[PDB]
Amino acid sequence: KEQNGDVKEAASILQELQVETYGSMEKKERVEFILEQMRLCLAVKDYIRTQIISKKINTKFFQEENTEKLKLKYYNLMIQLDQHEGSYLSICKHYRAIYDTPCIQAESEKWQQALKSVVLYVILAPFDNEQSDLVHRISGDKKLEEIPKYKD
């Protein structure tokens, strides 16, 4: 139904599906379904439901073996959600989590883009103790030399 342009109908159809109920369902499959629900809700811009689904998914799965793609997609969707919301500090934290992934770390352009986003969003964040802490942490990074303008 999404491929036919019925994004709202597809999101509504996928929303009623409660992944947590199906215990026998594989954890990676469950998280993939959760991320699909996230994507559909963001496509239909139901940000409250997206936040609820974000509360549904746990943050300890992304530190596993083959969860790199799931981690990247989930953090991209969370970045989109907080981009609509405007919480720049949460966006910076999500981008930092993206940058710490080994897959992005390996590829040059991907980690460079992740660091660019991290520094730009920590710049966008309002001044506070946590923002200053994050600025100190990000500034004390050696890879910033690969992005001279961003380091300056």
Partner 1 sequence: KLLEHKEIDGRLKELREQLKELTKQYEKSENDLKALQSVGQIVGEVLKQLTEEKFIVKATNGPRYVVGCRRQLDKSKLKPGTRVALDMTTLTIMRYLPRPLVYNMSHEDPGNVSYSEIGGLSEQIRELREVIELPLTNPELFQRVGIIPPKGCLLYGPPGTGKTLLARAVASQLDCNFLKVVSSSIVDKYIGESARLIREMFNYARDHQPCIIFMDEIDAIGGEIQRTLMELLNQMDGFDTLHRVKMIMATNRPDTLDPALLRPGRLDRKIHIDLPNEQARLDILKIHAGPITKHGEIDYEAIVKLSDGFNGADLRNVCTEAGMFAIRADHDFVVQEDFMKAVRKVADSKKLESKLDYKP
Chain contacts with partner 1 (rule: CB under 8 A): 20-21, 23, 52, 55-56
Nearer of residues 54 and 80 to partner 1, judged by Cβ: 54
- Which CB contacts under 8 angstroms, 24+ apart, belong to 8-11? 8/44, 10/40, 11/37, 11/40, 11/41, 11/43, 11/44, 11/46
Alpha helices in 44-101 (DSSP H): 47-56, 68-85, 88-99
Nearer of residues 55 and 136 to partner 1, judged by Cβ: 55
Least Å distance, CB 36 to partner 1, is 20
Between CA 42 and CA 1 the distance in angstroms is 16
Least Å distance, CB 124 to partner 1, is 26
> How many residues are given for the chain?
152
Nearer of residues 64 and 133 to partner 1, judged by Cβ: 64
Nearer of residues 85 and 141 to partner 1, judged by Cβ: 85
Least Å distance, CB 81 to partner 1, is 16
Least Å distance, CB 64 to partner 1, is 17
Identify residue 94 by its one-letter amino acid code: H
